[PDB]
């Protein structure tokens, strides 16, 4: 028994927390990402990068803490602790936003490790690896939003900050500057996510309301046995119900569950494609035909042109505070605004 | 026997290709009415003075909209919450200019979806099923009612109902955020958890079932042909799926009871959507999301910003531009 | 007014949900299938195919 | 050289449900992207 | 409206090409 196989045995033991070879990458990297985020949201400020308090130590709450993105002056520097910026000074590394790349990079490798874990466990137990394939969706989202978008932009500063209100800021920023709602790829993402939720709800309810009478209790949960060979609910009755209610119904269980995988995953992937576009400011910002007609015809108004106006207002009012490194100075009189407001 | 009994037997018949039922006797007319009007208005309706300031907004395709920008525009702010049926307009042109189609479509649609939920119960009763699919359906219905009925009621005008269009939906959302800070409202946070988690659990359940499919096909044909409609035998190995998942996270976090698993799949998104519907319905009464603007002060008393202040800047930018000609007085109360 | 209106709209909705839950359950229990479909007498199995 | 029948050839299938699903997908993609194609 | 001059042809082909792909495959099925 060579040392490699002895290690393989130890790593793949049946214990409370399976480790596996993938655990070597997953657990330290996941721990770094999670502990870095908790440490930043508890203790670390964004005063020097954003001019914002972003930790419990400064009086922020769960909704307003964040591991904020680094200062825009660093471009896409990876901001290693030992790098030319912090130069091994941990306190400075915290103050310049080193925690953001720390968390982002360890999270990316922890995500890799987790998908490798999915593969490893699927191989060990003897099933098909469709869980890893499904997890590719969240991976695409994380790569596109947290890595690809800022890499296309001027710096990590424009990456989403790891915090609740930081994420909301990123969301509103994308609306105002990129008109992300108008983007057909975001639209397909929305459809995928809403359809996934719909499928989850409808499938759970359908199963729960076509159950077979397999027990005597009003509590129907105890009339199932994991080793039972037969279906626990009536696919035939479910199909008839949905055919008569909605017009169509699933008749193939395998297709149903594959569809439940396919919908949200496809949605995540399409929205990731859209975010890649936004990284290069390749927006679906405008419909030129309506823009031209409005520029010539002062009576032409659509909801599209109204949304354009909202975006203009948001940009002008938010940019000075959202981009403090720019030293934007917008005198009050240049701010766009409607009457009386 | 009697003509009425025969009619009853027909309406409640489980042999109709589409179940009608007593709820169907209301659903079908109202839904067809809403659909016909919606199609006609989306294609060809003239512009609507939504803000009541004689500034009509073009919603239909024939007036220069594409599919993304087109909409059935909410009725005029001058109408407010008044009932505006066709017969209360001096002319069809007047009814159209003031946004009557929106009211017609919305009222019929809402009647129809409530009858759809009743019809789901009715058919489950006729088929001897358990009765609670309609309860799951009450989540989307609640959200739709919030955005088309409850919010306009609280705000005092159908002009503030969600427009029946894509870009109109986005406009609704942006203004809603500007006025209520829905992102910082925990019920919307719960709705987001509902939909993100529902999609997560959909992907997880679908993938685990697909992963544990029993070999019944060859590598050439679709594995879907391994399942035959109406078999009792289980088409996948739930114990193998539990083995995998309980090793992915840990044993006691994995369901091994399919009934409890499917109850959880039903309950999670439904509860999340109920909560976000209630969030919209209560922001209808202007009980808004959290306001932490200037919550953090330094020792001298100067405000230290947080991400909430940046969000508020965005909200103000949206607010000052929205309905740019509609406001005469400094506070957007109505 | 905001506190009262919001709270009572939420309570009204959840009691509508409760009404739906209990009305459906009461009907199913009276007809005797609140515990699931009896495999022997699954009603759909005696029903003609839709098309 | 001789021309021998290739024994690797297999039929392809698209069932009616798959047809409806694909046709709906194509129609809804067209609905989505036509406005942007026109700009 | 002054729309992109390739809009109609792009939309028609975007729909028609996959439509005919599906139609061919469906119709020949069972051969």
């Amino acid at each position: 028994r060579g040392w490699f196989d002895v290690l393989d045995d130890w790593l793949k033991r049946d214990r409370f927390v399976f480790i596996g070879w993938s655990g070597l990458l997953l657990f330290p990297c996941a721990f770094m990402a999670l502990g870095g985020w908790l440490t930043g949201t508890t203790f670390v400020t964004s005063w020097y990068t954003h001019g914002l308090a972003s930790s419990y130590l400064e009086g922020a709450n769960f909704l307003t803490v964040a591991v904020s993105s680094p200062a825009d002056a660093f471009g896409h520097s990876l901001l290693f602790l030992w790098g030319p910026e912090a130069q091994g000074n941990l306190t400075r590394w915290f103050q310049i936003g080193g925690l953001w790349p720390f968390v982002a990079l360890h999270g990316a490798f922890g995500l890799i490790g987790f998908m490798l874990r999915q593969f490893e466990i699927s191989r060990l137990v003897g099933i098909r690896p469709y869980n890893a394939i499904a997890f590719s969706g969240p991976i695409a989202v994380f790569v596109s939003v947290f890595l690809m978008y800022p890499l296309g932009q001027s710096s990590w500063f424009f990456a989403p900050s790891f915090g609740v209100a930081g994420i909301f800021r990123f969301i509103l920023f994308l609306q105002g500057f990129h008109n992300w709602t108008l983007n057909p790829f975001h639209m397909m993402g929305v459809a995928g996510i809403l359809g996934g939720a719909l499928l989850c709800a409808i499938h759970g309810a359908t199963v729960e309301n076509t159950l077979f009478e397999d027990g005597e209790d009003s509590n129907t949960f105890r009339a199932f046995e994991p080793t039972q060979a037969e279906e626990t609910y009536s696919m035939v009755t479910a199909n008839r119900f949905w055919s008569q209610i909605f017009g169509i119904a699933f008749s193939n269980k395998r297709w149903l569950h594959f569809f439940m995988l396919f919908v949200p995953v496809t949605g995540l992937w399409m929205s990731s494609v859209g975010i890649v576009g936004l990284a290069l400011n390749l927006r679906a910002y405008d419909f030129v035909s309506q823009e031209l007609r409005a520029a010539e015809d002062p009576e032409f108004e659509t909801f599209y042109t109204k949304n354009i106006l909202l975006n203009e207002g948001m940009r002008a009012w938010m940019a000075p505070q959202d981009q403090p490194h720019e030293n934007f100075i917008f005198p009050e009189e240049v701010l766009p605004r409607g009457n009386a407001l | 026997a009697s003509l009425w009994e025969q009619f009853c037997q027909w309406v409640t018949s489980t042999n109709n290709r589409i179940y009608v039922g007593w709820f169907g006797t209301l659903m079908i007319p109202t839904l067809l009415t809403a659909t016909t009007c919606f199609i006609i208005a989306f294609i060809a309706a003239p512009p609507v003075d939504i803000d009541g300031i004689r500034e009509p907004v073009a919603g239909s395709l024939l007036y220069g909209n594409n599919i993304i920008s087109g909409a059935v525009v909410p009725s005029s702010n001058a109408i407010g919450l008044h009932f505006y049926p066709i017969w209360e307009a001096a002319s069809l042109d007047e009814w159209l200019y003031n946004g009557g189609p929106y009211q017609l479509v919305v009222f019929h649609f809402l009647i129809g979806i409530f009858c759809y939920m009743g019809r789901q119960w009715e058919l489950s009763y006729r088929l001897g099923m358990r009765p609670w699919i309609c309860v799951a359906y009450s989540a989307p219905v609640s959200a739709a009612t919030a955005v088309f009925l409850i919010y306009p009621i609280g705000q005092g005008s159908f002009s503030d109902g969600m427009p029946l269009g894509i870009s109109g939906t986005f406009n609704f959302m942006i203004v809603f955020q500007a006025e209520h800070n829905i992102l910082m409202h925990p019920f919307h946070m719960l709705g987001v958890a509902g939909v993100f988690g529902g999609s997560l659990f959909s992907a997880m359940h679908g993938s685990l079932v697909t992963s544990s499919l029993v070999r019944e096909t060859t590598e050439v044909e679709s594995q879907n042909y391994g399942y035959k409609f109406g078999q009792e035998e289980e088409t996948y190995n739930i114990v193998a799926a539990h083995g995998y998942f309980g090793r992915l996270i840990f044993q006691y976090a994995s369901f091994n009871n399919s009934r409890s698993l499917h109850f959880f799949l039903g309950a999670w998104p439904v509860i999340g959507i109920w909560f976000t519907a209630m969030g919209v319905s209560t922001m209808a009464f202007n009980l808004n999301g959290f306001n932490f603007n200037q919550s953090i002060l330094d020792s001298q008393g100067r405000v230290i910003g947080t991400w909430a202040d940046v969000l508020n800047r965005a909200n103000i930018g949206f607010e000052v531009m929205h309905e740019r000609n509609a406001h005469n007085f400094p506070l957007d109360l109505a | 007014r905001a506190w009262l209106a919001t709270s009572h709209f939420v309570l009204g909705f959840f009691f509508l949900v409760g009404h739906l839950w209990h009305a459906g359950r009461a009907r199913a229990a009276a007809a005797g299938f609140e515990k699931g479909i009896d495999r022997e007498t699954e009603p759909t199995l005696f029903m003609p195919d839709l098309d | 050289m001789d021309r021998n029948s290739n024994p690797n050839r297999q039929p392809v299938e698209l069932n009616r449900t798959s047809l409806y699903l694909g046709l709906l997908l194509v129609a809804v993609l067209g609905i989505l992207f036509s406005s942007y194609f026109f700009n | 409206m002054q729309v992109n001059n390739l809009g109609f042809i792009a939309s028609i082909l975007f729909v028609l090409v996959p439509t005919v792909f599906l139609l061919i495959l469906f119709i020949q099925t069972g051969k």
Binding site: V236, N239, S243, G247, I248, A249, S251 | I43, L61, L62, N66, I67, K228, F229, G230 | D49, L50, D51 | N15, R16, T17, Y20, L23, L24, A27, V28, G30, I31, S34, S35, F38 | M1, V3, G7, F8, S11, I12, V15
Partner: peptide
Amino acid sequence: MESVAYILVLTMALAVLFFAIAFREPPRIE
């Protein structure tokens, strides 16, 4: 004339719905 293209795609989608309902593959138990 782009309106014609929008109406065409919308009609195609609705027609697909009608056929998928009316002319569906019957679910059969066997």
